[PDB]
Design a protein around this ligand. Structure first.
Ligand SMILES: CCCCCCCC/C=C/CCCCCCCC(=O)O[C@H](COC(=O)CCCCCCCCCCCCCCC)COP(=O)(O)OCCN
Ligand SMILES: CCCCCCCC/C=C\CCCCCCCC(=O)O[C@H](COC(=O)CCCCCCCCCCCCCCC)COP(=O)(O)OCCN
Ligand SMILES: CCCCCCCC/C=C\CCCCCCCC(=O)O[C@H](COC(=O)CCCCCCCCCCCCCCC)COP(=O)(O)OCCN
Ligand SMILES: CCCCCCCC/C=C\CCCCCCCC(=O)O[C@H](COC(=O)CCCCCCCCCCCCCCC)COP(=O)(O)OCCN
Lengths: 406, 406
């Protein structure tokens, strides 16, 4: 025919190729080539330990100590309490007002009890504090969705009474609830999709990814960031804006890499390992936030579980139960900022209100990046907005907690 | 509807997402964040020079010296000679046998003259030697395609004589030929596609990419590879296989990064700058060789110009002018290996026949990777096959030439 068309190079902006799966395999190949010797070393050196049954027996030796696993186990009380008020109002008792009050009390207690235990106890590690508060905020969102879905499938039955798949009143079983609580999702649903089998190879690869990226994050921190912080061990709350920026410029890129590894290690490897153990089959925990040419598209695709919980339990109901789309969006912003400063600042016992100010500054930044940049330049603007952006607030919190202790 | 489908995570193999444009913008953002200060520094420090008109006047001060630009300029003699035999047999003279002999003489001279000048001159730098030989092999392929296309469009006219677009005998103009010679293509064609305009912004970005990635390659070499080579300055021709491998394991990853930057800097930035200056509009210089889950698919998409020149001037004619598809493929292999060892080993004056042995070993490696691995594991196997693969042969040549001189 004609050996020469009129086209564009694949790497060009106006080409629209977008088939770069292989820039991922390249990053995997290079991470492995660079960390595989050390990973086999640390795996034989740490995997040879007797961790599994010794740490559990040690914790069982002194309950009421190690208050973070104590909190995580006590969360079952709130789980069972929600299940009880549900299964009790499922038949005859607790007219909707009473059940809604019991559930609101249970939810507010899920939120305010672990915060209290964390603040009013000195023997609780901050990483364990964070695990307790994150488990309890996950449980809070899960039980909020539980209440909402059961209320819906109960109003529907009450209506239709005067006109394989499990119907409404037959899903209130401890098996069901405690499968939902460990499901990689925040939106309750009768008849979750299911995977055919367990795929031992997939689960093994997920566990390997978790171990590898854990060791990689440890490398990143201990060899790029802890040295840089220890060069000038001065808290951010006392430094000035100039010195703060001079230090954050040195700390940003390692912090960004650590956050990318958190995202992968958690929203792909950990959540897929969980969803594979208990066959879950949905497995859309994230969407392509990396090719997000705006901050608004970034937030709507980072953390798909939380976002769809938001959109169908906190934003759509506000539009229904009221008006002012603007007020719904600002309420979503408020809730997200509250949960961020509650996850980052209650474990570290700080309240400098930095995560909140960063979450705020995301707004003018979002308008800026949405208005000025487009396409791949907008995507690069979003990548900048993530390198400094919000993760720098969490970095400031952790930097202050590091230099104020060791 | 139903908030939970049955799907897979985007990073999973069996998902088939492949929209990772944004893992590229991330690499650009990070390369810029890591090298921008130094790049502005080296640009003000090197761009302030009076390079443009001083080096040309200095070369014009002593022609017959600097033999590499002398060779590149003398290539115009072969260009004009091919154009002359064409435009002369275009009308009445040089029956096809005579014209074919003149063109074969011209081509063999294009190949054997710069090799001779390079070998039989001591004052020629190896980088300039390589530029001369690469310009002359590009000219050879271009003129081969020129001969073939004009022969075709002349046989067609001779036939049809006894039954906007430019017809055959009206394309033989110096403007046309010397546009073709500088076109980013190896396949001649009457009526090349054309771009509408010059797009000063695009050309500026291409020049910026060329400068940036040149400085980046200089950084890579001088700060990752020259130190590593100077730690043990021992030629590869004298070391044993064990020590050779011990050193190549240390040299591979920097060599691989340098080769990726060569690929980009040349097959995208340089070729697009050229194609934009002289509006060319075709601009398919490469295809997605990065997501190539086999070595055979890699070769067929790395270097699209050379590959399509191959497929429609050296492989399809052999299938036509003969048989034995196997023999056509092995002839393609032979020609590629010859040109590789002629580009890498004539400038360095070495003839250890290493590039040839690597090009050979690509064959069993290609069968291996094609048979055993699939999908993303096949792609990772190809990435391995590029990290050690063929570029290590060129690395061995350059390492020997470095340690044997400085
Ligand atoms: C004693 C000798 C030590 C050195 C030689 C042995 C090294 C062995 C390496 C072990 C590391 C294994 C864990 C790495 C972390 C990643 C785990 C993994 O398989 O990740 C997978 C990613 O893998 C890929 O993408 C393709 C496979 C990559 C294999 C790369 C092999 C490199 C060479 C190995 C040897 C390295 C030697 C280094 C010497 C300096 C998960 O894949 P997915 O595409 O996301 O989807 C799969 C589910 N659909
Ligand atoms: C104030 C002057 C500008 C900022 C400082 C200089 C930065 C370096 C300047 C130039 C080197 C650029 C090398 C790569 C060029 C990439 C061109 C481009 O548009 O990339 C695009 C993607 O990349 C971008 O958009 C990058 C935009 C910049 C992001 C990085 C941030 C720059 C500003 C802060 C710099 C701070 C440096 C100091 C840090 C301590 C699209 O890709 P493509 O394949 O190139 O296609 C374009 C044509 N269709
Ligand atoms: C020491 C290791 C050096 C590795 C250098 C090559 C790797 C390039 C670096 C980062 C890759 C960034 C990828 C795009 C980020 C957005 C998407 C994302 O979340 O990516 C995931 C996040 O991963 C990352 O961000 C990787 C972080 C890289 C940390 C690099 C540490 C370098 C340490 C210093 C090395 C010094 C070498 C010697 C210097 C003289 C990666 O996903 P995957 O495992 O590839 O998925 C495949 C599943 N089958
Ligand atoms: C504390 C530790 C020591 C200090 C930090 C040291 C950092 C410097 C060390 C190593 C980095 C050396 C350079 C690695 C990347 C080589 C260049 C490269 O891959 O070029 C790319 C070539 O890519 C291809 O041919 C596709 C296949 C390979 C995928 C690209 C991989 C890029 C890796 C980026 C790593 C990011 C961190 C770099 C840090 C300087 C050109 O792509 P582009 O510019 O993104 O184009 C899109 C816009 N049109």
């Amino acid at each position: 025919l004609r050996c020469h068309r009129l086209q564009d190079s694949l790497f060009s902006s106006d080409s629209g190729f977008s088939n770069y799966r292989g820039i991922l395999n390249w990053c995997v190949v290079m991470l492995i080539l660079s960390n595989a010797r050390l990973f086999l070393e640390n795996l034989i050196k740490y995997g040879i330990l007797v961790d599994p049954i010794q740490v559990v027996s040690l914790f069982l030796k002194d309950p009421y100590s190690w208050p973070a696993p104590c909190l995580v186990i006590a969360a079952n009380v709130f789980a069972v309490a929600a299940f009880q008020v549900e299964k009790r109002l499922a038949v005859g008792a607790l007219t909707e007002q009473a059940g809604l009050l019991l559930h609101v009390a249970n939810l507010a207690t899920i939120l305010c009890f672990p915060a209290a235990v964390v603040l009013l106890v000195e023997s609780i590690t901050p990483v364990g504090s964070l695990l307790a508060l994150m488990a309890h905020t996950i449980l809070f969102l899960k039980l909020f969705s539980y209440r909402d879905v059961n209320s819906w499938c109960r109003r529907a039955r009450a209506k239709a009474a005067s006109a394989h798949t499990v119907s409404y009143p037959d899903n209130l079983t401890y098996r069901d609830l405690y499968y939902f609580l460990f499901a990689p999702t925040l939106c309750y649903e009768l008849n979750f999709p299911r995977s055919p089998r367990i795929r031992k190879r997939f689960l093994l690869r997920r566990i390997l990814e978790m171990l590898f990226f854990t060791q990689l994050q440890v490398g990143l921190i201990q060899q790029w960031m802890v040295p840089t912080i220890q060069n000038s061990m001065k808290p951010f709350k006392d430094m000035d804006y100039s010195r703060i920026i001079e230090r954050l410029l040195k700390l940003a890129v390692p912090n960004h890499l650590i956050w990318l590894i958190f995202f992968y290690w958690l929203f792909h490897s950990c959540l897929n390992a969980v969803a594979e153990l208990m066959q879950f089959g949905d497995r859309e925990f994230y969407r392509d936030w990396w090719n997000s040419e705006s901050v608004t598209y970034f937030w709507q695709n980072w953390n798909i579980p939380v976002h769809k919980w938001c959109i169908r339990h906190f934003y759509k109901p506000m539009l229904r139960r009221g008006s002012s789309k603007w007020m719904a969006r600002t309420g979503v912003f408020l809730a997200s900022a509250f949960f961020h400063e509650y996850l980052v600042s209650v474990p570290l016992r700080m309240f400098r209100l930095w995560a909140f100010t960063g979450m705020m500054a995301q707004i003018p930044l979002a308008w800026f990046v949405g208005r000025f940049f487009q396409g791949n330049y907008g995507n690069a603007a979003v990548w900048l907005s993530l390198i400094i952006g919000q993760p720098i607030a969490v970095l400031m919190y952790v930097h202050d907690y590091y230099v104020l202790n060791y």
